């Protein structure tokens, strides 16, 4: 492959519920933010950005 996030994402989606929305929102919030948690959960601080992200609501918007 030659782009990280969609690989990352992939990683981090694969075992999702809802698989294709939590690709949608790996890859948003890898576009802005240039990591993704390794997992499949959790380990949200290794990417402060990918954790903090909030939506309008003021909810945590990156799987």
């Given at each position: 492959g030659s782009n990280?996030?969609?690989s990352?994402?992939?990683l981090r989606?694969?075992?999702?519920?809802l698989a294709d929305r939590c690709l949608k929102?790996?890859?948003?919030?890898?576009?802005?933010?240039?990591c993704v948690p390794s997992?499949?959960?959790g380990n949200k601080h290794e990417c402060p950005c990918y954790r903090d992200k909030k939506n309008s609501k003021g909810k945590?918007?990156?799987?």
């Open positions: 990280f996030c969609d990352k994402c992939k989606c694969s075992k999702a519920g929102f790996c890859g948003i919030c890898c576009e802005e933010c240039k997992g499949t959960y945590s918007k990156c799987p």
